[PDB]
Design a binder for this molecule. Structure first.
Ligand SMILES: *SC[C@H](NC(=O)CC[C@H](N)C(=O)O)C(=O)NCC(=O)O
Ligand SMILES: *SC[C@H](NC(=O)CC[C@H](N)C(=O)O)C(=O)NCC(=O)O
Ligand SMILES: O=C1C[C@H](c2ccc(O)cc2)Oc2cc(O)cc(O)c21
Ligand SMILES: O=C1C[C@H](c2ccc(O)cc2)Oc2cc(O)cc(O)c21
Lengths: 235, 235
């Protein structure tokens, strides 16, 4: 494939999706990363890379240029789920996208559930807007899609990529009691989520497997995430 | 491919996405259609086909069975965008999915814009919730993605599939003054949208092309849609 510049941020779970994808493709050392400070975005980012002014975004092909001076000739692509599929499409030996058409749809249907149920339900619960049961209900929906063993469609796929950055950050929010509920309520919810027992037994094992995946650990600055998350709550 | 049963409804734009896709694949006469009455859903639909109780849904493979008695052995798939990609994946000679990885991402990015901007903005405006300018702004976003000529990425693709059912129904809503604004306001907005002139000139030509596409006309019961839409407004 042509040269890739990835515009990312350690803080952003949507961006880690693309970092995980590149790492699964064992291409993480072939691409140039540039970190965007989301509180102080470069003035060139929105007009030259992504008018939505969000990470991730990729500059694909074109001449060799400094990453803070992206070329007009590179192809600009945004949206983490789309970029994950682009990475699968560019590096087929990654096996991110299953060959079988049925298995692809099931991976993409799981992503739909990550997108329309888990993430919004996590957002609402971690901010104190909704109930614990609303969050657990959304997780049980995903659990019900899981096969008896393995990842979302057996073999690791884009489905697991979509979920993992939000799972690992939720773990941090809950382990450290940053979810807006009294002390110990956070850690109790983590155990429900990841113990491997109880109503979310199967999801708990799956969660253990997602967070052990090499690609996740290598692209997850837990110390940086945990430090930022405590400061945010402190306000 | 194995046998396909498609659970659909003339009224539903999300379902027409799959009908358009099948027709582009020149496979519309190979699949069994079953019409779901969304006001009186069969009792077997949710437990045996799609627990979300929505159309479209596909039963894939399995034995030959009556469509109102779907087999446990067929693979059940739901979500119109995912089913459109499944159809592209099953019938590659349809050319619904471009070969080039960059062109696929651009088609899918357009769909993201159809999904996150056009459809929600149309929904809000057609019900009287938001402003005309909010709707036109969302359309101009899509316009800005269009190439100088052709469909969303040049060649017809899944991108155009995603949009067309909502465009053709919006046309009906607006032509017939069913949008909640005084008489003539509907028809004025249609001309803005489809004239090929003005601020939405390029989109207007594109709209002309989407609504002339054979696949759209063959899967669009305009008389049935127009009759239902007038009755709805009449309440
Ligand atoms: S997490 C950082 C933000 N990213 C996104 O919101 C990406 C979401 C996209 N829809 C996607 O790609 O999935 C970000 O960059 N936000 C900018 C900001 O600071 O508001
Ligand atoms: S238009 C008919 C309804 N379909 C959908 O809502 C499908 C949306 C999906 N998210 C998709 O596939 O894109 C439907 O069947 N509604 C059931 C009802 O009557 O409420
Ligand atoms: O069709 C979809 C929609 C789904 C999605 C659903 C809701 C949402 O808010 C965001 C994404 O994401 C996807 C991700 C993919 O890799 C491939 C797909 O075909 C889809
Ligand atoms: O990644 C996405 C998300 C996009 C989408 C975005 C927002 C939304 O609400 C629904 C869908 O739909 C898709 C449709 C596809 O064919 C392939 C894709 O990769 C995607």
């Amino acid at each position: 494939p042509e040269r890739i510049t990835l515009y990312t941020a350690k803080i952003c779970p949507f961006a880690q999706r693309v970092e995980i994808a590149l790492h699964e493709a064992k291409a993480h050392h072939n691409v140039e990363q540039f970190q965007i400070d989301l509180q102080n975005k470069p003035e060139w980012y929105a007009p030259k890379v992504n008018p939505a002014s969000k990470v991730p975004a990729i500059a694909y092909g074109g001449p060799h240029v400094p990453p803070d001076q992206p070329s007009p000739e590179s192809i600009k692509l945004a949206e983490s789920l789309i970029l994950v599929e682009f990475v699968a499409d560019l590096f087929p030996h990654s096996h991110l996208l299953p060959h079988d058409p049925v298995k692809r749809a099931q991976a993409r249907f799981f992503i739909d559930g990550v997108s329309t149920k888990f993430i919004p339900a996590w957002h609402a619960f971690s901010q104190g807007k909704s109930s614990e049961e609303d969050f657990l209900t959304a997780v049980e929906h995903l659990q019900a899609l899981l096969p008896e063993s393995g990842f979302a469609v057996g073999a690791y796929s884009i489905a697991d990529v979509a979920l993992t950055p939000f799972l690992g950050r939720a773990r941090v929010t809950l382990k450290e009691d940053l979810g807006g509920y009294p002390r110990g309520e956070g850690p109790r919810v983590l155990a429900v989520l990841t113990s491997g027992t109880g109503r979310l037994a199967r999801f708990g094992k799956y969660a253990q497997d997602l967070l052990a995946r090499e690609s996740f650990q290598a692209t997850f600055d837990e110390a940086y995430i945990t430090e930022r998350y405590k400061a945010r709550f402190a306000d």
